[PDB]
Amino acid sequence: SHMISVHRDTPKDNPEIPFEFTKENLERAKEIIAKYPPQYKKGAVMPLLDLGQRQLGFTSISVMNYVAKYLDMPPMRVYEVATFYTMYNRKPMGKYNVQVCTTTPCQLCGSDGIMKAITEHLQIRPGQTTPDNLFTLQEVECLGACVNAPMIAVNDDFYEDLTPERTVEILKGFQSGDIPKPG
Amino acid sequence: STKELTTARIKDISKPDENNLQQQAPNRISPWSKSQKPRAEAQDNVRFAVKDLAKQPRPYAAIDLIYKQPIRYIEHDNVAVCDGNGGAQGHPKVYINLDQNKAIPCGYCGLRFAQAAFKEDIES
Amino acid sequence: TDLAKELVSGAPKELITERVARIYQEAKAATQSGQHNTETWKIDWDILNKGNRWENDLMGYQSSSDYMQGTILKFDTREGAIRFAKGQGWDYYIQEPKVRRFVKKDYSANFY
Amino acid sequence: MSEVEPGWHYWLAYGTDVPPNQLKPEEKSVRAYPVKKHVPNLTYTDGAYVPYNTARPKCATWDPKVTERP
Amino acid sequence: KEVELTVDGVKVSIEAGSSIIQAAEKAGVTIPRYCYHEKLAVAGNCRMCLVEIERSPKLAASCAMPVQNGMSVLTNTPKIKKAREGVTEMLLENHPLDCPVCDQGGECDLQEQSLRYGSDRGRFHEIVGKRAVENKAIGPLIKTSMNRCIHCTRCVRFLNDVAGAPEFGTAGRGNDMQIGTYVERNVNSELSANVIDLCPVGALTSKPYAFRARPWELKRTETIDVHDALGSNVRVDTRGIEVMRVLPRLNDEINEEWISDKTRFACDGLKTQRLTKPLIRQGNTFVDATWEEALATIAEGFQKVQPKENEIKAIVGSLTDLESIVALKDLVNKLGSENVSTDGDATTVPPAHGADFRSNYIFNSTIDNIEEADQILLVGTNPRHEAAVLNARIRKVWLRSDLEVHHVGEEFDSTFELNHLGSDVNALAKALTGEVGKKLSEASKPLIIIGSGVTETQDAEAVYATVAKFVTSNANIVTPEWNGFNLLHREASRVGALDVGFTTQSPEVANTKAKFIYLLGADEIVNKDIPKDAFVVYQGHHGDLGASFADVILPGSAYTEKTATYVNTEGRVQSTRAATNPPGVAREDWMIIRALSEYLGATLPYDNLYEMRSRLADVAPHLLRHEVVEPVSEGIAKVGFQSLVKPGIQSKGVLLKNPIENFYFTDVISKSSPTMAKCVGSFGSKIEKIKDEKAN
Amino acid sequence: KSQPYDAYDKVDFDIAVGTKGDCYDRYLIRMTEFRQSLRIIEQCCNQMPPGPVKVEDFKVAPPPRALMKEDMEALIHHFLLYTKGYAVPAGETYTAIEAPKGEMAVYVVSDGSERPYRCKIRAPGFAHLGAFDHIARGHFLPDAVAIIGTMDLVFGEVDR
Ligand code: SF4
Ligand code: SF4
Ligand code: FES
Ligand code: FES
Ligand SMILES: [K+]
């Protein structure tokens, strides 16, 4: 998780870039508020923020400004929410997201080797973005796959019990479009 | 003139001259504080009527000197550590954050630190 | 107390005729949250309408002809200050300190 | 006695064992300004230093302008 | 209700539901704290106030733990002192070694508590180094050095709750938590600069005051703030002849330890554009003249034009003191003239509230009682500008109870929610007889607030008649134990001028083409008629439009340079205190009038302050009770409310436009303050810009 | 001997006592106090221990400059020691030493603040000069010069 808590407007991100939900995302958003009482509808920022994240690709400033507008909140109470949680991407982030747990229960199964194996193929370090924008490696804390320790996480999938020779199957395939089966 | 000699500026306009006694300092014409009394007005006084203004103390203005230093550039780290380059004979150790795309000067020394990756934009 | 004790103090007559003293208790400073400098009563003299401070021409000092500018007295009871002011025959005026009004503060109040 | 240069003024008083011409380059003072000939005490001359206030006055009087009624 | 408890053997009796720290502070035991402030919501994160309770292993945050009955509270166990030094050893782990270059140097709570409650040695020689943060830019008034923040959230809690500026918060997590605004935008509140006082460390400091003084140099003088009519109690710090900074001081009835950004950052106007020498107009320019020559010229000029009985006009400015008002009022009547008024923009010759009854032109409910009001009606007032601190008082009530605020006038961006009703007299007419008027009568202590800007409209008399008609026919609005009608003033010398009746009630006199005009600090006379053949004298302390029109200019002293009397909007009589001397040969304001009289053959009886202070007893005997309000007796008040009701008044339907069209330029000192110039460029005339173009 | 202070209890030294109470006796005692000082001075040269020269309490003693410029709490204490001072617990005292002139003592009154409330200085010469009239009674002008010298009247102490 990249811990910077001051946003700088880029050519790719600024409040001047409009953001509007798609026709489908309105239906989900209208029904997402259905889980919260009328006098506390502001609790639905976390769903809408990630819901709006997927429509655009990441958690842009326009998303936070739009989400605040939707729920009648000052834009700061969304900024506090957005930067507290580690699954909101405040950057283009590219296509895929490799999450490599490096915690101790995972590190007991040679979780270092998976890190070296990935860094070899893509010519990138953790927390970096590939020159093609297809991939963006990212270290991560515990994901729950500790009993099946040496686990990689791509987007939202699972690949447990891996080796540097297990990394050859996936890193080659995703460029070709042949995505292996998660699990 | 008396227009530059009596108003403080961040940078001068004309090249300073060491022989000109009306300059604020031998290496700077205009004063460097809003409340600093100009040297031209200071010496236009009765007590200087029969003096030799060339022999009064004229230390070199420290603002002009400090900006003649190069900018330190840090490699693969956004935090600079400065201590006055003397340790126990310098200023207290202060850590400078270089996230912003500019050169952040040290609070005591006045040395300006930046990132290497930001040098090209800074040097524009 | 009742005596005109100033006739034995040798102080200049102008402290009785021409100057005004003030009996006050120092107020709490906004910057700091300490509450100790506001527990002793003090006496200070008013400044002069001219000649309290003027810039020295040569070195830019702060010249003054007020010989009471740096005189502050300390007490521990309000009455002692008033009694002492009465004894010297000072033309004082008392500044009653403000009293903060109590308001109970509860952690749970942020939601109720 | 004010004609003795400051570097040697310390050596003469048995304050140091290394004369200022035998100084290590990592012990010389670094001056970023030109150093001129030594100037002795200038009292009883015209070069005697004159003190002055280095601060501007603290109040700026009004720059008067006249405006005429309609 | 009260629960009796002992703290370190001292019996404590406090209200139930209070926290331990208030109980301890009442017993005299001092419990160190950073994050606890007695005007903010309780956060329990700084962990410095920890105490030990007898029936527990777990240390209690005394700022959060509510009080019990029969509880035994310990504060000086060796276990506690170990905790206090542990916490101190943590705050200073990342704190920079900035004390020499830090503007909080001699007055920083992190220094004094660390000295008192922490260890005398540090155990942090780590080679990685401390944490470094980038300073955020949040305007031209607050200078941020976020390296020094101890993450205590006083800035966040104040700005969110008290100030109503939700753009300030905590962005990030853990060791990278960064107080700020996330994106770069300036903080927009008229009370934003009070955060400078709350921030216990050097993280948030004054930008105008930066690097100029250390707190042990300054001399603290307790006086009042006269940039607006509330008369907030302030503390003026002077280093010799200059006034360095202005801070609030505790007064729970008026300001409650806050001052608006105009009040504190307008101190630098006192060093600019000052009138220091008497000036006499020659040709189209001014020349310097002595008090002998300037007083003679006014005496000579007065006899040249020979103004008649009521051809002498006296105009009093907003900042003018009460002693000069009576000195001038007596002087003009000593010449036999009653063309004495103010420089405001009132329409009807007898001002709608009048000067006969005090109850019709003050804040009869008193500010300290606005807390217990049930319903408030705003009539043509924008408290966010006219009385900034009073606006924050109404918000604090509206947040802790079910107070509902009703507004009639021009709609404005307000800190608290409004119930808008309309923008003309007829809009208020239906509202009084409609649903909202029913709400007020059912309530115990409803409030009706009339602004100062109501008079400056064409329908000045209609609104006063309309609202009084509602007041004159109720029992809840005016009781023996309540007086629910209030008027909000904004110029600091209205109530003083009206208490002494410095106002003409003759419409023909107010239309007289006066020849000799004596401007007493009046600087807004653009609409006011000044004929080309009038000899005008301006006595003030700043050079502005009032001095430009003058033919002889007599320098005067600001409120920080003299002892004077001011009556705030609610009728409280407050006397300033002298902090410095007037610059140059500038004299006292009421002393000029006495000296001018001796040249004009109207030698006034007064010779000194005490003689003149006896005169204030004559004009109104309540003007000798400082910091004491003389409320209007209930019976006599109801007489005044009736004479405001007048059948045969036409409502012209004029929008009740607020009179303050620029929050920062309102008085003479504000227009000459360099810092206020930055605010207008950065924030705007209405504090509405969110981006600072002026940034370099 | 009566109230030993500052390592005067560790060294061994004698004192000399007169018998005639005249100037010659006081001359001899002082010349003995010379040689007893030279006897203590040698012992302090031989018994000098290592360690701190000041209280290891940064709230009353400034921290070393090197520690000041590197440790945060040292900088805070260095700051408050040189501007605010250190507070002294309230009370009063009367501390006397064997000054070379005689018994010198101070009566310091504290108020819990950083500045002494009162400080009376008891200068030995001041009490001696009072007894000058009682001693010079019955002596000649050349004898007065001896009595002043035998009293050791440095008038900074007399006119404190
Ligand atoms: S905030 Fe206090 S402790 Fe921190 S640097 Fe400033 S003066 Fe020192
Ligand atoms: S900036 Fe100041 S007020 Fe805000 S949390 Fe930090 S220390 Fe507290
Ligand atoms: S420790 Fe790696 S998933 Fe839990
Ligand atoms: S004062 Fe209680 S934890 Fe901060
Ligand atoms: K501060």
Ligand SMILES: [Zn+2]
């Ligand atoms: Zn440095």
